[PDB]
A = this chain, B = another copy of it.
Amino acid sequence: CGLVASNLNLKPGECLRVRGEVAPDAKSFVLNLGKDSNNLCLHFNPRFNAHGDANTIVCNSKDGGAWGTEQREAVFPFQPGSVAEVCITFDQANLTVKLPDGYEFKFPNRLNLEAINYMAADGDFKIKCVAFD
């Protein structure tokens, strides 16, 4: 269990930037964003070698404790033993996740949050900097 931040008050259009070091023997890491641990508009889970998955970004939501429908992306711009920056912004329709190597994707915003107030990091990613636009 890594850094947990609350009262972020991240509003639509504002950018959250997270830079961290991926462990040389990294298996996976998680950034969770939402209201609290039971209410996540984005569970962002790069899997290097975890849950039978290799070099796959798994995303999901959590609403009132219930995991939503998982989605997977088709690009994996992470390397064990390197520094990586993730940048996230949202509006009512979508979260936009911007990753290294120019890659960006959208994940549907399935919750009804006015702001993103909670972020939790876990796994093989040492957070070095967080910036709130």
> Which residues of A line the B interface, CB within 8 A?
1-8, 127-133
**Top-10 shortest CB links A-B:** A129-B131, A5-B5, A4-B6, A130-B130, A4-B7, A3-B7, A128-B132, A1-B7, A2-B7, A3-B5
13 cross-chain CB contacts under 8 A:
A1-B7, A2-B7, A3-B5, A3-B6, A4-B5, A5-B5, A5-B6, A127-B132, A128-B132, A128-B133, A129-B131, A130-B130, A130-B131
A19 CB, min distance to chain B CBs, angstroms: 9
CA distance A49 to B5 in the complex (A): 29
**Which residue on chain B has the smallest CB distance to residue A2?**
B7
Most chain B C-beta atoms within 10 Å of own C-beta, residue among A5, A128, A131? A5
- A129-B130, A129-B131 given; 10 more Cβ-contact pairs under 8 Å: A3-B5, A3-B6, A3-B7, A3-B8, A5-B5, A128-B131, A128-B133, A129-B129, A130-B130, A130-B131
A39 CB, min distance to chain B CBs, angstroms: 17
Give the residues in chain B near A4, CB-CB below 8 Å: 5-7
